Amino acid sequence: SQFGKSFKGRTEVTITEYRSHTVKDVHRSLLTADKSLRKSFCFRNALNQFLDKDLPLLPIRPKLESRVAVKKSKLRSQLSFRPGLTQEEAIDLYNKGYDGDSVSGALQDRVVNEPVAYSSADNDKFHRGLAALGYTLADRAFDTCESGFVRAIPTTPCGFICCGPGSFKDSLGFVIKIGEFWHMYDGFQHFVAVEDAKFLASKSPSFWLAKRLAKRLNLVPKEDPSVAAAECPCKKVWEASFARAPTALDPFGGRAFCDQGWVYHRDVGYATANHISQETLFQQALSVRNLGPQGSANVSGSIHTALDRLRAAYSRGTPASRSILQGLANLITPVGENFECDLDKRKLNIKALRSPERYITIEGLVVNLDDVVRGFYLDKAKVTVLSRSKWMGYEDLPQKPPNGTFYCRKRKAMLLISCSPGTYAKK
Amino acid sequence: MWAFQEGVCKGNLLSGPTSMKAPDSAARESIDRASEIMTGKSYNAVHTGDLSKLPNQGESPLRIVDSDLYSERSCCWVIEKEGRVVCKSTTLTRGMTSLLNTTKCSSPSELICKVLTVESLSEKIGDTSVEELLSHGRYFKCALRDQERGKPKSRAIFLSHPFFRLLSSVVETHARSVLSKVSAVYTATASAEQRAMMAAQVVESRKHVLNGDCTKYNEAIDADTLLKVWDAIGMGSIGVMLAYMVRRKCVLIKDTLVECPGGMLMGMFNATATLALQGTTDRFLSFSDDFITSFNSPAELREIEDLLFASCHNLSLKKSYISVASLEINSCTLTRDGDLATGLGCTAGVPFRGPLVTLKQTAAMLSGAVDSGVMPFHSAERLFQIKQQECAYRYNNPTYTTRNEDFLPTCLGGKTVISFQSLLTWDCHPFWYQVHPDGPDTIDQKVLSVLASKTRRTRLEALSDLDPLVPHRLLVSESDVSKIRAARQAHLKSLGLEQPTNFNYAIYKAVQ
Amino acid sequence: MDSRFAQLTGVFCDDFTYSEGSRRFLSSYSTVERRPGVPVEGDCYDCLKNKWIAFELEGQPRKFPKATVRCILNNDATYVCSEQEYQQICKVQFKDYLEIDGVVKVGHKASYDAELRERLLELPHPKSGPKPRIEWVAPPRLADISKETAELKRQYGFFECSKFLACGEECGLDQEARELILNEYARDREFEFRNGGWIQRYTVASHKPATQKILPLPASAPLARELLMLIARSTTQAGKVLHSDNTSILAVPVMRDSGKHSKRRPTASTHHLVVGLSKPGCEHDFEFDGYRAAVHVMHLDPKQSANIGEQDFVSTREIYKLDMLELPPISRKGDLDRASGLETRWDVILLLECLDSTRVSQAVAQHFNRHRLALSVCKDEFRKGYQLASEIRGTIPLSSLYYSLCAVRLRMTVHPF
RNA sequence: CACAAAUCA
RNA sequence: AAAUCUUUCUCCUGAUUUGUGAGUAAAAUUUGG
Ligand SMILES: Nc1nc2c(ncn2[C@@H]2O[C@H](COP(=O)(O)CP(=O)(O)OP(=O)(O)O)[C@@H](O)[C@H]2O)c(=O)[nH]1
Ligand SMILES: [Mg+2]
Ligand SMILES: [Zn+2]
Ligand SMILES: [Zn+2]
Ligand SMILES: [Zn+2]
C-alpha cells in the first residue's frame, strides 16, 4: 500500500511522478573509487564473471578502413543528423517484447554538433576522435554514379539526373508536390500521399519514398486507402530531362530538381557530408532560388524571426541580392509547416526592420543580410585593420585574399579580410 | 609548468579543489555582498535600459514541462509544525510529491491552474493556501559546491522550495523563447565552442574585442529587474509571485534564517538575466555573465560600458580584458580568423578512478583534443601509452586482477598495450570495446553503480516498459498500475518471452 | 489530444459494453483503456464501429484526422455530431452540464495581482550605485609580479626545512629501518596503540590557524608518484606503516579522547596525520638505534587525502611538456639561478600543486592565461587578481600560490610575451 | 524521458 | 597535534557531447610496493 503513503491524499498521479518516485536512490560515500573497487574483491569478481560469461557474448564490431586526405582548417561544427526509430518501427518493436523505456528513448530524431577542425576535399564527416586521420563515415561506394549522386560535381556523368543533366534511372525515385497531394514515383509504383492532421496518409506507408517523405515533412506515416489524385504527370516528368544543380545532398539525402520536388536514391540513406558550409552556402541558396521551402539548413533561434529579417533585408537591394535572400529563406524554411518562406508574399515587419544590423545564423554561419544586400559576400571583401605592426607567423596578403588574417605591405598593416568573395563565391 | 606553455592553457590538468568546510561562511559572504549591493555603494542593481521592445508572450498557453519538476537533486522542503519553520533537504521528487499531497493536485499543471484561479490569497487549495505557499516558497537552504577549478574557496549553492522551482520553470522557458525570438545571435542553447565560433564571426568587422565577464552577477540582479523583464514578456501573476518570493527570500544558515532581499542567489534565472541585457541592445553576444562585444574607437567602448552598467551587468574589472588578435568566450579562445588558439586550452587530466574508467576517460579526452588542433595524433598515442603504463603501475595488484590472459590490459595482468589509433578504429579485442569512448560501460562503472544502489525500505509497484506512445502526463492509480503490469506480463507470456529484452539502437541499425 | 477533455471523455465511456461484456468506448486519456501500440487519432475509440471520436467546441477545430468524427459541442445546451448514435449518447450522458475549463494563459492576471504588486512596492528597493571609471592600461609588467612575490615573502617568510615536501625524496633508509623509525616516532609521541595500530588522541583545540610559511624547494621529487600512491592507499589503511618501493608513510587517525568510552574505530570523517620520512638535517630529526631521519607530519581530512591520492603525476608532466618552453633553473626559493639552479625543482613544484588540495595554482594559471592573451586591462584591478593569499590558509596552499607567482615571474623574465 | 562521465557558466 | 568550529559518531540552476534502461541485502584496516 505504498501508493497510499508516497502519494497520500491522492488516488491518481501522473506517469512522470510515479516513474520518478521509482528510481534507484544512489548514495555518495567518502571512499575513493579504487578502495570501493577493492572492497570485498568486488571488481575482481566482476572481472572474473565478465571474462567467463559476458565476454563471449560480445558482437565483433567491424573495423574502420575508409580514409581521406584532410587539412587543418578553422574550428567548424560537424553536424550529425543521426535518426531515431520511426513511429511505426517503435510500435513494432514494442509489440515484439522489447524494452519500452529503451525504445522510447531511441524514439527521438536528434541533431548533434561536434567541434572539429579538419576539412577534406569533399568536405565529409569524420568519426569521433579520428578527424585528424580523416576516417570518414561514408563507406566505399559500389556503383560509381551513386558516389556521383552523393557528390556535388560528379567526375563521370552517366547522362542522367543522378550525376548529370538528364532523366531518371531505375534506382532513382522522386517525390513532388502536385496540387494538394504528394506524388512519389520510383519506376514501378506511383503513390499519392496527403498531410492529414499530423499524419501522412498514404496507400502503403512501407514504400521507401513514402518513408523518406514522412521523415522530410516530420509526419507520422499512416494507411489510408481513400487517397487518390486527379492528374498524374509523374510519367511525363519521369521521362523528361532536368538540370542538375551542383550541390551536396540535403541532410535528408535528396536533391531538389524542381519546385517542391526532391530526387532520392534507394541505396543512399542519409547525406554523409556537411550539406551547408562556408564555401557552399551561397551556391546552395542560389540553387533553391525558386524551388519553394527546402528545410535543409537549421537556423539558430526562431525561424519566424530569421524569415522576418530576411524579408526586411529583401525590401531593398539589387535583384541578385533579392534572389540570394529568397534562396536563403527557402533553405531555412521547413516543408509543409505554416511558414511563409516566399519573401514576396511575406508581410513586412517594421519591428525587425528598425534593427541596425540583420544577422542570421545558418548552420553556425553568421551572415549579415545587410552586408549581403550591398554586395559583400559575393562582390567585394570586407577589410578591417587590426594593427600597424607586422605580426609573427602570418602570411602575406594575396591579390585576391580569402577570409582570414593577413599582412599587407602596400599599406604596411595587419588586415582581417572578412566576407571575402574568394571564400563564399569561389568561382 | 602552465606558465611556460607557448600557447593558451587554463591549468586544468589537476583535479578541482575539495573542501569539507561548512557552507555557512560562503553563504554569509554572498548574502552580505547582496545586501551591500542593495545599498548602492559598490555595484549597481538598478535597471535602466529600455525593454519595451521585447515581444509579449502573455497570450501563450500556460504549459508546464513535468519532467523538469522531478529529479533526484536536493531541494528545501518547508514544514510549519507549531509556528516554527523547519527546512529539510529532500530529493526534488520527494519535495514535489509532498507539495502535491499537501494541496490536492494530480499534477503540477493542475496545481498552478488552481493557484492562478483563486479569488483570495487565503482560499484553501487543500491543506494550504496561496499565501502559505508564497511564505514557504521563499525559504532556501545553503550548501557548499566544490571541485571547481580556480576557486580555492568553494562556492555557495542554494536549494529552493518546490513551489519556487515550479513557478520559475515557466518563466525560464518563456524567457528562453523570447531570447530566441529577439537575440541577434541566439546562444542560450549553443555550447561554448559554438558561442566562440559565432563570436569570431560576429566581431570580424571591428578592430578591438572586449573579452569581458560580469562580477557579482547573482547579487546584482534584483527582483525588480526580473519583474521588469517578466512584465516586458508578459508574465502577469506568475512573474509577480516569483518576484515577491525572490524579494522576500530567506536562507537557512546553520540554524538561523537570514534575509537576502537583494539579488537572486542562484542561476535559476540565467535566461531572464541574459534577456535583461539582450532586450536593451544588440551589440552584445552574451549569455549570463559572459559577453564578447567588440568596438572600433574609445567612444564605442564607453558606449559599451554604459550599456553594461545600465543593464545591471556590472563589468568585471579583475577578469575583463581587451584583445585584438584573439577572443575568448566560455573559456574557448579563437583567433580573429576563426582558428582555434594553439595550446592546451581547456584540456584536463584524468584522475585515477578505476582500471578501465581511467583509460576510457583518457581516450575520450584525447579524442576530443585530437579532433581539434590541440595536439597531433602521435602525441595522443604517446599520452595514451603513458597513461596505460601508469594504470599498469597502479592497478596491477592481486586485489584488482587474478588473470593472466594475453589480450587483457597490462593493468589487469595482460600484456596488451593498445594503440590509440587501433582502439579508436574498433581494431581491438572485444574486451577493449568498453575502453572505447563510444563503447559500452566498463566493468568498473557497473561495479560502482551496483555498490551505490546496494546501500540504503518499501518500493512502489514498478511502472517500467511502458508504451512508447503513451504520454507521461496521463494519470495512473494504484489499480491502474496493477492492471497495466498484469496486461504487460500477460502479453509477454503469450509471446513466451521473459522480462522485456533490452533494446540497443546501434546493434539494431547494424543488423538492419 | 488535449487533457482538457479527459474528464469529459470519462463521462462519455460510462459503462458502455459490446460483444457481450467487452467495453465499447476506450478513452484515449486512460492508460488501462488505451490499446497498446496503436496511435491516437481521437479522444476515444469505438470498437463496435471501429471509429475515432473527438470532441470540439464552436469555432475551435482540433488537430485530428478527417476520419475522426467530431462531436461538436454547440454554445447552446445541444450536441451535434455526424453520427446519430454518438449525438444521442452525447445528449444522454452529458445530462449534468459539464463546462470545460477554459485554457489558462501564461499572462493570467490573478485576483491577487494588485495586492502582490502593492506588497512588493512597499518592500525595500535598491539604490542606483556608482558608475565605475574604467581606465584601460597595459597588463601588469614583471615589476608587479616581483612586488607580489616580495610581499608574500615579507608577510610570511620561509620555513627552515621543506617539511612534507622533503618526503618527495628518498630518506636513505631501508624498509625495516623506516618501519622501526615510524613506529618508534609514534610511540614517543604517546600515540595510543590499539589492535596493532596507532591512534592519535586529542582533548582540546586552540581553535587558531597553524603557522603559515613558504616551503623551500627540495632538489627534486623522484618519489612523487610513489608518495601520491601511498597517500591514496592510506585513505582506508590507517594506523599502520604503509611501504613502497623506496619510501613509507604512516597515517595515524586523529580521534577524540573521551577517557573511558572513547572512539575505537575511525569513521567516515576521521582525519589522518600522515607521517613521512626524509633525509635528516632539520629540527624534526628523530633517531632510534642509530637510524636518523627527519619525520614530517601533515593533517588531512578524508577529502584532501582522496584528492591528493587520485592525482596522476607522470601524465600531467608529459601533457605539460607537450607544448612547454625551456624551463629555466631555479634556486631553493624559486628564484632564477643559472649558476646553481636545478631544473628538477620544477617537478617538485608540480608535486606541490598535487599536494595543495585548494589548487590555488589553478586560479593563478587562469589569471596568467588572461594576462598573456590580454592587450589592455583595467588599471589597478587586473593586477589585483594575483593577490589570492586571502583565499587560502595553510603552509601547503601558501607555498603553492607563492611558487605559482614565481613561475609567472620566471615566464615573464626568461620568455617575455 | 531517468541515471552516469567529461566540459562551460 | 594540524592545511584548526574540523578531526562527533550533502553538492543547487542551465547548456553541449557520449553510454546505459526489472539486476535484488551492513562498516574505513581484511586487500594495492
Ligand atoms: N547555481 C550556479 N550558478 C553557477 C554555477 N557556476 C556558475 N554559475 C553562474 O555563473 C555566475 C558566475 O559564476 P563564476 O563561475 O564565474 C564565479 P566568480 O568567482 O567568477 O563570480 P564573482 O564572485 O561574480 O567574481 C554565477 O553567479 C551563476 O549565476 C554553479 O555551479 N551553480
Ligand atoms: Mg568571458
Ligand atoms: Zn548516375
Ligand atoms: Zn503523380
Ligand atoms: Zn623538517
Secondary structure of A270-283 in HEC code, one letter for each residue: CCCECCCCCCCHHH
- Which residue, among C95, C74, C65, C70, has the nearest Cα to C83 in the 3D structure? C70
Give which of B181, B203, B171, B204 is closest to B278, Cα–Cα: B181
Q: Are A403 and A73 in contact (CB under 8 A)?
A: no
Q: Which cell numbers in the block locate residue A122?
A: 569533399
Instruction: Quote the DSSP letter at residue B9.
Output: B
Length in residues, chain B:
512
Measured between CA atoms, the residue of chain C closest to residue B64 is C106
Helices and strands in chain A, H and E counts: 15, 17
DSSP symbol at A345: T
Q: What is the full DSSP assignment across B468-481?
A: TTS-TTSEEEHHHH
Task: Enumerate the nucleotides of strand D whose atoms come under 7 Å of any protein CB.
Answer: 1-9
Q: CA of B251: how far to CAs of A401, B32, B137, B243, in Å?
A: 59, 12, 11, 16
Query: How many CA atoms within 13 Å lie on the side-chain side of B19?
Result: 28
Are B203 and B294 within 8 A, CB to CB? yes
Summary count for chain B: helices (H), strands (E): 17, 13
Say if ligand 1 is within 6 A of residue B169 CB: no
Q: What is the DSSP string of C127-158?
A: ---PPP---EEPPP-HHHHHHHHHHHHHHH-B
- CB of C39 within 8 Å of any CB in chain A? yes
Q: Which amino acid is at B252?
A: L
Residues of C in contact with B16 (CB under 8 A): 359, 362
Q: Is the CB of B222 under 7 A from strand D?
A: no
Residue B209 lies in a domain: yes
Domain spans, chain C: 3-93, 139-157+313-414, 163-310
Nearest nucleotide to A101 (CA to C1') is E21
- Pocket probe mutation, ligand 1, options B266, B286, B319, B320, max atoms within 8 Å of Cβ: B266
Contact A48, B402 (CB under 8 A): yes
Give C43 to chain A, closest Cα distance, Å.
14
Q: Are A122 and A155 in contact (CB under 8 A)?
A: no
Q: Which three cell numbers stand for residue C206?
A: 586552540
CA angle A131, A135, A138 (to 5 degrees): 120
Q: Which amino acid is at C139?
A: P
Burial annotation B257-287 (CB, 10 A radius, 16+ → b, else e): ebebbbbbbeebbbbbbbbbbbbbbebbbbb
Q: CA–CA distance from A171 to each of A106, A159, A161, C180 (Å)?
A: 30, 14, 11, 84
Q: Is C193 helix (H, G, I), strand (E, B) or coil?
A: strand
Size of interface A-B (CB pairs under 8 A): 341
**CA distances (Å), B229 to each of A377, B46, B180, B239, B269, in order?**
37, 13, 15, 9, 11
* CA separation, residue A9 to residues B52, B82, B104 (Å): 45, 22, 7
Specified resolution (Å): 3.1
Which of ligand 1's atoms lies nearest the C-alpha of B145?
31
Concatenated DSSP letters for B299-343?
A: HHHHHHHHHHHHTT--B-TTT-EEESSEEEETTEEEETTSPBPSS
Report d(CA C228, CA C317) in Å as an integer: 14
The answer as to whether B9 is a domain residue is no
d(CA B499, CA B493): 9
What is the number of the ligand 1 atom nearest to the C-alpha of B266? 1
Total domain count, chain B: 3
Scanning the structure block, which residue is given the C-alpha cell 498531410?
A: A195
Which candidate from C39, C63, C235 shows the least CB-CB separation from A35?
C235
| CA atoms of B70 and B111, how far apart (whole Å) | 15
Range of the domain at B328: 24-335
Task: Give the DSSP letter string of C32-46.
Answer: TTSPTT----SSEEE
Euclidean distance between CA atoms B218 and B273, whole angstroms: 9
**C312 alpha carbon to ligand 5 midpoint, in Å?**
26
Q: Check if B216 has its Cβ closer than 6 Å to any atom of ligand 1.
A: yes
Residues around the ion ligand 5 (C-beta < 5 A): C 161, 282, 284, 294
Check if the beta carbon of residue C82 is closer than 8 Å to that of residue C32. Answer: no
CB burial of B120-147 (b: ≥16 within 10 Å; e: otherwise) equals ebeeebbebbbbbbbbbbbbbbbbbebe
- For B202, the 3-state DSSP assignment is helix
Quote the CA–CA distance of B81 and C253 in Å, as a whole number: 41
Same domain, B200 and B278: yes
C-alpha cell at A172: 532513382
Chain B positions touching A130 (Cβ under 8 A) are 367, 370, 421, 424-425
CA B477 – CA B46 distance, rounded (Å): 50
β strands within C147-232, DSSP E:
192-194, 197-202
Q: Say whether A419 counts as a known binding-site residue.
A: no
Closest among B445, B423, B438 to B353, alpha carbons compared: B445
Question: Alpha helices, DSSP H only, in C216-359?
Answer: 224-233, 302-310, 313-322, 345-355
Identify any residues that bridge with B213 across adjacent strands, giving them in sequence order. B290
Contact B443, B431 (CB under 8 A): no
| C-alpha angle C191-C197-C203 in degrees, rounded to nearest 5 | 35
CB distance B289 to ligand 1 below 6 Å: yes
Which residue is associated with the grid cell 582500471? Answer: B355
Q: Check whether residue B442 and residue B500 sit in a common domain.
A: no
In a domain, B145, yes or no: yes
For the CA of C160, the nearest ligand: 5
